[PDB]
Write a protein that binds this ligand. Sequence first.
Ligand SMILES: Nc1ccn([C@H]2C[C@H](O)[C@@H](COP(=O)(O)O)O2)c(=O)n1
Ligand SMILES: Nc1ccn([C@H]2C[C@H](O)[C@@H](COP(=O)(O)O)O2)c(=O)n1
Ligand SMILES: Nc1ccn([C@H]2C[C@H](O)[C@@H](COP(=O)(O)O)O2)c(=O)n1
Ligand SMILES: Nc1ccn([C@H]2C[C@H](O)[C@@H](COP(=O)(O)O)O2)c(=O)n1
Lengths: 241, 241, 241, 241
Amino acid sequence: MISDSMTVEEIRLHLGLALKEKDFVVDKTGVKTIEIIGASFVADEPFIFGALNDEYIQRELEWYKSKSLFVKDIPGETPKIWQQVASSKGEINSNYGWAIWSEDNYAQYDMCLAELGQNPDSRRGIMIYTRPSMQFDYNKDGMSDFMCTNTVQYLIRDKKINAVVNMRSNDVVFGFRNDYAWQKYVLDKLVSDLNAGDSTRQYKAGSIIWNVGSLHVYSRHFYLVDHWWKTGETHISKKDY
Amino acid sequence: MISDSMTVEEIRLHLGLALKEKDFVVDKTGVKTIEIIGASFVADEPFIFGALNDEYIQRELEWYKSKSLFVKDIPGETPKIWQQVASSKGEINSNYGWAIWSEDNYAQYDMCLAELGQNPDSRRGIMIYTRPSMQFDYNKDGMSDFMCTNTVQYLIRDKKINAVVNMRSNDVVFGFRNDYAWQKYVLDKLVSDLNAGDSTRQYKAGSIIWNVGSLHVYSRHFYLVDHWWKTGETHISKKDY
Amino acid sequence: MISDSMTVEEIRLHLGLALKEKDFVVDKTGVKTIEIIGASFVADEPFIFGALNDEYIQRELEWYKSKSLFVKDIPGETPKIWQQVASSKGEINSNYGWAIWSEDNYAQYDMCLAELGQNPDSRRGIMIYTRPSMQFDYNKDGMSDFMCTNTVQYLIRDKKINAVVNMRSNDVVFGFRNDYAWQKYVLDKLVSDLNAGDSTRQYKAGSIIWNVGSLHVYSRHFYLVDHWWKTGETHISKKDY
Amino acid sequence: MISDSMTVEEIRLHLGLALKEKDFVVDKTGVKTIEIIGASFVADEPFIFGALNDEYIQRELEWYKSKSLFVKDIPGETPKIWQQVASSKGEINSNYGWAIWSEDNYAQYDMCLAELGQNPDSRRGIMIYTRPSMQFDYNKDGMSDFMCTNTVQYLIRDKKINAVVNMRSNDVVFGFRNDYAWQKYVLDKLVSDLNAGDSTRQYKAGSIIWNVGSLHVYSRHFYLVDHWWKTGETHISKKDY
Ligand SMILES: Nc1ccn([C@H]2C[C@H](O)[C@@H](COP(=O)(O)O)O2)c(=O)n1
Ligand SMILES: Nc1ccn([C@H]2C[C@H](O)[C@@H](COP(=O)(O)O)O2)c(=O)n1
Ligand SMILES: Nc1ccn([C@H]2C[C@H](O)[C@@H](COP(=O)(O)O)O2)c(=O)n1
Ligand SMILES: Nc1ccn([C@H]2C[C@H](O)[C@@H](COP(=O)(O)O)O2)c(=O)n1
């Protein structure tokens, strides 16, 4: 059986509680955050707070498909968030397409697909994003990019493929929205590829279970949590706030 | 805030429910298991079902301290569970001492200690056990040992150090008991080492949060679950059952 | 008496002659081969052309020992030659360990051992790899794997155990090297097991006689034959050629 | 190219040498044999020693065409050689018509014909006589009949169809004469059927290459080898000897 987990609605409540109680933690950039430690919830909505920017997510998807470790290869103007984290040569670590499709990271997608194709009940169907050398690689050439996704495990039960996403660190506003879109994309892809392999499989996408070491909101987004706390609206304009 | 998690008592309940409903999944060895997918709970007891064997855990600890990848180096007679999983030369992957203390796995303990010593609020204090090449290494020389612990993250909040344990796969009876004893040992060690570095830190061991992709009981241990279901006792003799 | 057979040196000569005369046969993949039909020789060297890869043969041995019909179970990264031949679920037919050690294939090794242990002069000591249903099984679930080893017979004469290997099809470069290493392993095993049964037997490994319906070199390896023809060297680098 | 093989004349010479040198091997019935191990020769004559009994061969052909596994179904009086090998119910294994024409043995003739009709260059055109379960079937109900023909492979090269006959065991005097007549019959049949399928094929019967694990003469026939050794005559009456 799948575990009885929190939903995104309950996560919102706990974040609102944390803000109400001034449970602040200082970020490495010196700014305040509110935070849930050891968060586990079913990602039953594609965002927690904020607006869905489908245009941005598609540009990040294209970049992941390219497997490029260089931020300039993001289609169009590279977001400053990626710029400020990049090395002196414009290089990063956290291209998730590189993580699951590159032979340099040992063919995570293909091997997980082969494992589940051979044994649908397997507990070894997993895509390993991070690596032990990340202890030294995170600041190569002056980048600041310690892989925040650790592993994603895929478990086929009752003809549904469930994804257990294990993250070290996840920004509630920008991070979760983008990362969810990515994990949903890969899950749908894996379902497709397994079904294409054998027409009698008839697998369906199941639940995405989100496990985060530190799930946090930065102080620049406190107004979103606050507004939701007062009104139940998951988004405002900064100007309307 | 730390997430409001299940406890071990609630895990026991959900496992008993799975057995009551005959919710069986077939193991790779062909035997039945009951299973909770995406389990997340606070490890507030040192076992789930079965008895505590302090003698065995100490032998496994000594082996981890040696960092040897060879099962014969386990003090005394090597358990057959380690024998059957080993390669043709007696080698394995899953020596956790090797994982966190070897320079070959990039000094996970020392680097996590250095990170937390420098920034106590860090989200980057993590010990990475598994590796991307595990897709190929798991059956090197005919072993059958795909690392079941992925990562363990350590978060210092309110002067308590919390461990977020991310496991791919965990046997409820033997695995959890042994692995918990190990994770508790490492957490106490890390608290000690940080306190030894600065007397004003006064850190204390916090909660160990257990995240498991597949948390399962093998059919050979169903009698333990069944007995607890009927009586509330967490252990019987196989003969008494 | 053992028949007065060709040796590997003479096979090399006849292959070089076939290439010199442009005696080409078109493979099922559309590529050219040179070929000796009804080849019979004593395998008095462990290869014909090309280098010996002890690392690879040991991985294939480990896989045979596992008896797994799934190519992912080959230790490490599965060679693409095994990948392209496998079914939609990664399954094959030609695990020779399965052929001689599985109860599913009627215990070929054990029965041949029992036969020779009881009557050392027997003509019925044989390990039957292929099966009549191979006419239908060769492309089960879209695999392309028609068993190339038919039978191996073992004859004890003058306290030496001779193996008569009957193959339908054998690639001179990769196939013969790997298959010889396997047949030599099994012969040494059988000698050991018979000697262990009775200390007065004092059997020794005899000759391995290789009988092949089609013994062929693929066009991608013609440079090896051509080079040996010119120089007498049984191996070059593709780059050096 | 077809391998440069021994002829029947050279086989005669080697058998005569074996007798001259008293290279005897004890049969399972307690009688002496002389023997060539791993014999490979082109069957360029229809007998080795002895007389051609066309009358007997035609009765065995009729029996094979019937596909009956019962020896009483041999036309006329059943030869005592077939009687002494039969089960308590008169049953045997080695009806070669059953082996290649029965659906019970997976339609060996038809499938080999379909393979060569689709791809004339195929290395997979083979009729598999024996089976893995022969390890247990050879003495079913007290018969003594371990299939002595393993496989026959057909290779079409230069519009000639060559047959590579792989036998475990073959009696030089009665066995080879009968078995050769059978294999020649099937080869001619296969040529006919392929030619009837397409008038532009114009295939012709090629060589029959005979591969035998143990090619032997029983002591009751030593007088034939001896007489040939002295006179070069391939047959005498027992009375004239
Ligand atoms: N795909 C990504 C990449 C990064 N982050 C966010 C999480 C943290 O806010 C920050 C990483 O900081 P740290 O490494 O200090 O956790 O980036 C995220 O949520 N998702
Ligand atoms: N320290 C360890 C090592 C192993 N396992 C158990 C979990 C599974 O029962 C099995 C691994 O099997 P799989 O790789 O098929 O999950 O070993 C565990 O619980 N803890
Ligand atoms: N153990 C093996 C398995 C396969 N083959 C080679 C022989 C042929 O090159 C090919 C099989 O093709 P076919 O079935 O068309 O003969 O694989 C081999 O030599 N030895
Ligand atoms: N069609 C057949 C059937 C049988 N045999 C002969 C070969 C051996 O002399 C004997 C079988 O004995 P074994 O099984 O001990 O080899 O029968 C043969 O030559 N041809």
